Design a protein around this nucleic acid. Sequence first.
RNA 1: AGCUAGUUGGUGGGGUAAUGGCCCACCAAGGCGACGACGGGUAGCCGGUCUGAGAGGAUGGCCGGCCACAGGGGCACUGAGACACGGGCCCCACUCCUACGGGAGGCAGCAGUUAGGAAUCUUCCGCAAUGGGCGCAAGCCUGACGGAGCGACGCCGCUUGGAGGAAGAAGCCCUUCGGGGUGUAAACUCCUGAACCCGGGACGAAACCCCCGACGAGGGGACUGACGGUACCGGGGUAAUAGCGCCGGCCAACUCCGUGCCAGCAGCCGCGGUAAUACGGAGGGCGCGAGCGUUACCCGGAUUCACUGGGCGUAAAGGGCGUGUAGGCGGCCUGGGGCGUCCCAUGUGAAAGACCACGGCUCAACCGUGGGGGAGCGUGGGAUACGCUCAGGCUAGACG
Lengths: 138, 71, 124, 208, 83, 99
Amino acid sequence: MLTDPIADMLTRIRNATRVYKESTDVPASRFKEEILRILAREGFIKGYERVDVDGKPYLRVYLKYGPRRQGPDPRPEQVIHHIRRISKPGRRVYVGVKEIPRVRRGLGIAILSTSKGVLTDREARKLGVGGELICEVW
Amino acid sequence: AKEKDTIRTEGVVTEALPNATFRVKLDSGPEILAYISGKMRMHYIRILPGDRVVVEITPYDPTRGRIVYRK
Amino acid sequence: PTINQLVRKGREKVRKKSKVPALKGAPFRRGVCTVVRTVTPKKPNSALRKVAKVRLTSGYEVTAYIPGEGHNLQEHSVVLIRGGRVKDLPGVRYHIVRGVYDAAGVKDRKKSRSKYGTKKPKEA
Amino acid sequence: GRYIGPVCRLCRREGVKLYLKGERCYSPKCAMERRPYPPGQHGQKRARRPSDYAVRLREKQKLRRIYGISERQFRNLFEEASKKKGVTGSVFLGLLESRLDNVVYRLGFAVSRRQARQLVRHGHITVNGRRVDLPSYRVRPGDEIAVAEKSRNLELIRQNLEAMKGRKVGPWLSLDVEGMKGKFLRLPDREDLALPVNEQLVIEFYSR
Amino acid sequence: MVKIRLARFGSKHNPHYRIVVTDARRKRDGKYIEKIGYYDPRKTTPDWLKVDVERARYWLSVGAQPTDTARRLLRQAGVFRQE
Amino acid sequence: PKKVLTGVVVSDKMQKTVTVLVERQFPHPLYGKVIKRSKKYLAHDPEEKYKLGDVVEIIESRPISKRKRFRVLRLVESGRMDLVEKYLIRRQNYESLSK
RNA sequence: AGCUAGUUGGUGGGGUAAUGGCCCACCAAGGCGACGACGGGUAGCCGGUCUGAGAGGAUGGCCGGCCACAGGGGCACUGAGACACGGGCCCCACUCCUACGGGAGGCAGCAGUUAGGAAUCUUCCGCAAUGGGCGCAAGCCUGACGGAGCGACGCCGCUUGGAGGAAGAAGCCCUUCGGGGUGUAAACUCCUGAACCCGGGACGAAACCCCCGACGAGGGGACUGACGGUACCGGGGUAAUAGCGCCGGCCAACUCCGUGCCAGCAGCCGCGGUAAUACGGAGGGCGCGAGCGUUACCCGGAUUCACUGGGCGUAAAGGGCGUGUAGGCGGCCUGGGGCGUCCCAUGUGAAAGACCACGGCUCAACCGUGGGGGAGCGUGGGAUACGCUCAGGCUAGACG
Ligand SMILES: [Mg+2]
Ligand SMILES: [Mg+2]
Ligand SMILES: [Mg+2]
Ligand SMILES: [Mg+2]
Ligand SMILES: [Mg+2]
Ligand SMILES: [Mg+2]
Ligand SMILES: [Mg+2]
Ligand SMILES: [Mg+2]
Ligand SMILES: [Mg+2]
Ligand SMILES: [Mg+2]
Ligand SMILES: [Mg+2]
Ligand SMILES: [Mg+2]
Ligand SMILES: [Mg+2]
Ligand SMILES: [Mg+2]
Ligand SMILES: [Mg+2]
Ligand SMILES: [Mg+2]
Ligand SMILES: [Mg+2]
Ligand SMILES: [Mg+2]
Ligand SMILES: [Mg+2]
Ligand SMILES: [Mg+2]
Ligand SMILES: [Mg+2]
Ligand SMILES: [Mg+2]
Ligand SMILES: [Mg+2]
Ligand SMILES: [Mg+2]
Ligand SMILES: [Mg+2]
Ligand SMILES: [Mg+2]
Ligand SMILES: [Mg+2]
Ligand SMILES: [Mg+2]
Ligand SMILES: [Mg+2]
Ligand SMILES: [Mg+2]
Ligand SMILES: [Mg+2]
Ligand SMILES: [Mg+2]
Ligand SMILES: [Mg+2]
Ligand SMILES: [Mg+2]
Ligand SMILES: [Mg+2]
Ligand SMILES: [Mg+2]
Ligand SMILES: [Mg+2]
Ligand SMILES: [Mg+2]
Ligand SMILES: [Mg+2]
Ligand SMILES: [Mg+2]
């Protein structure tokens, strides 16, 4: 069974980025959607929409890439280099407002789920809240 | 100090023992455990039981010697 | 492994065995010799290294490496041990510390004194 | 104590002149001006590849010797610098400078650092009002250094003063050249000083 | 009995004292109840002795019984004065 | 603030005593993985008003027995044998895996 | 791997300042347990201390708090409080006296003896301060404490000089015989002036006491030093202890003689069996410096028990598979609960330390003062994304 959804989604995204597939699919939830929204806001993805493949709610995830730098390994520049799902199940990581990570000392983000909705570390700082660190992104 | 209170006494090789150690039957009494000198090893000079060899013996423990002379 | 497993068992803390049973972790232990002999090293090296079977105030009989240039130790003599593995020799994990009790200092020693128990020689 | 022994030997070792006697360590005589090579037997021997560690060590020695301090004290100073907020290197240098003996030296109260230290020890120097005889002392800025009144008589001191009578002091210090006084105003910077130190290397050395 | 008493804290020949509130039967340096005053007999300090007055008064009211030195100090810092 | 707990009846074999399993959820000191620790408390109820399968509120009281220091404050919710069954199964297993 | 019989609960009693299996009588037959009981080892615990980037790991000396014990065990008594360190009773262990019937003992209080042992202090002064007890008080006591002594045991501070002074004395060492090294180092000139002597010499100590004032506040007065004639100031006043380790790589520093797998070194690789940058010595260096090395022990480096942070086809490592219990985890929507989770407030988190600021001892150690932080925990409010839980529903999982 798909034991995590969010993590799976992230993995799929990563795979897509690796293979230079311009848009990936993934089943639809609210949490997932929220995460995607945040990503979009940041600039980690071109866009996203919510299709119905077969009959099941699904997400078009329009991936982002950097300009085709020529030479040895011409493969398109990576926008998302690494994205690790931090608060896995059976190891749920909750950081406080003191403890929210300085992810790549700024250049990237941690997707934090808080009582005041899904958001980024800067946003959390602004509101002055802690919560659950779903994932790391850079 | 570099101590030369060492005994340089003859001994007919009695016993073939491991690792080029050979109990050699001295004419300074019994057969002590006397081992090959490094020079011999270098020159591949073979000792079998029955060689009248000079054996270097320190007073501290005469138990162990040294086959100084090439037979 | 996986966090639940860890929780169940934990990590088996690397409990460390010491290289010296001089006991009490005693920096030094004193004792008296049962024998005093010389020992062949092994197969890398061939020399004759002076060593002493010494009974201890804790009871553990140890062959113990005498260092220096040549000792004056007899048999029923009080010696003090600092330990510290000798590489070549078997059963010997112990240096005798010359300069205390019956192990009098390394005579003629003139360079590295402290390790050997040599009193200062008088200059001009 | 200090180094206390053959000094310009250190200069020879370093590869660079270190003004440790002052005069002569100014003239054609620091053995560096002539003889510019390490002491000992192999002075002119083939100059070999210094280890990464080695260079750092050398740098540390240079710096430490320059001010002439026991290693322990130096270490402590470094630690303090590390603790205290700011650029650990520049700050460290400043702290080193802020030392009483060094302060005395930089005023032109004595031509040499060891000499300055000796002077300080002997109750010749008075900071603000008290004699201070402990050369490690931290001259905290906004402080005035003076010659002691019952010893402002001394010929040597006068000579030293004359040697600086006219010639310009550093921008962090000041002096009354007549009434045998002195001011310490700015806790000096890296760029305020012209020592052959590269404090980064020192820091690196300390790290392990 | 509870006393307002003094506690030594400094060093050899360099003493310092904490005018303090605590039960009789403790170490003269032990876990007291409340630190309320500090005093230096060597007077070196420009602001040497200082006590917190209201707290002291409160303690007195409950019936904290000061020892002699402590009493003196309190008087000096005007705890026992009345106006 | 007399320490209060939501626990579940597991036994009523003793006069006036209701055995209550408190499942306390806390995060591991080192790992943070949220553990689920059960602790039995024997509780005082002069009625035997409570039965197995019931979830109840438990107050830190003054003792009545060597190791019985809780009165049952109030009943929360009856009709959840589920939780008790599990415990019983576990207990049964405990005997089995020995020899 | 099962443990339990006062053992788990009950009723009544006793006992306790008080609850209680604390104990007892009677009844019930439970209680605990792999979420690790019982059993064994280990070990006072902690605030902390050390390390560490941190998370952590070890450690629990001094200083502070709590406990427990006063030869071992057992017991009470008195009292507000002990099951009573210098109080009692009893048995035993042991030493002491004995007119052999019995007695007296207990330094794990300071100091010291003795033993053990690598190893650890003076049978010190003082009641001055501070605190303790008593007392109306004076005062009395106080091996608490305050100090001194001994030990570089630790930290920190200072001295063993400084300024000049050869294209380079000797001495020693190397050499390609020219030379180089030691090394401005010396000597020598100049200056300073620890030691050391004399003159003075404390802060710490103003109270408690007496009197005015009512024995209140307030006011005046007096006594009061173990340290110690010390610290410290003023004059005088002498150039006046240097050591220890290493020197192949790691690792900072290189040559010659002596030795020849010998004697030896070694923390590891290893070096030595005749030209050894590894051994012995000499010079030279280099590290540190009144210390420096060795050894022990702890962490680190070891991301080498791995949470941060490793793995498992062949390196050590997947179990022989299956079913399945506990346990762990779990799709999508909607709503509630609000336990997790977060947050705010606030209570706590003693002092000492660590951290910052400033101050004091001539600096610093050391201390003082102020502040900040602090994981955790409690209490009141809040938030619902996520986990939990309750309810309803969905069909992607799963089953038919
Ligand atoms: Mg021989
Ligand atoms: Mg008093
Ligand atoms: Mg009752
Ligand atoms: Mg019982
Ligand atoms: Mg036990
Ligand atoms: Mg123990
Ligand atoms: Mg720990
Ligand atoms: Mg007893
Ligand atoms: Mg009573
Ligand atoms: Mg008793
Ligand atoms: Mg008593
Ligand atoms: Mg007791
Ligand atoms: Mg004692
Ligand atoms: Mg003795
Ligand atoms: Mg002994
Ligand atoms: Mg003492
Ligand atoms: Mg007396
Ligand atoms: Mg009387
Ligand atoms: Mg008496
Ligand atoms: Mg004392
Ligand atoms: Mg000179
Ligand atoms: Mg003079
Ligand atoms: Mg005098
Ligand atoms: Mg080198
Ligand atoms: Mg050596
Ligand atoms: Mg090899
Ligand atoms: Mg070596
Ligand atoms: Mg050598
Ligand atoms: Mg020192
Ligand atoms: Mg040392
Ligand atoms: Mg194989
Ligand atoms: Mg299965
Ligand atoms: Mg299950
Ligand atoms: Mg679950
Ligand atoms: Mg779920
Ligand atoms: Mg604190
Ligand atoms: Mg404080
Ligand atoms: Mg100060
Ligand atoms: Mg449902
Ligand atoms: Mg089918």
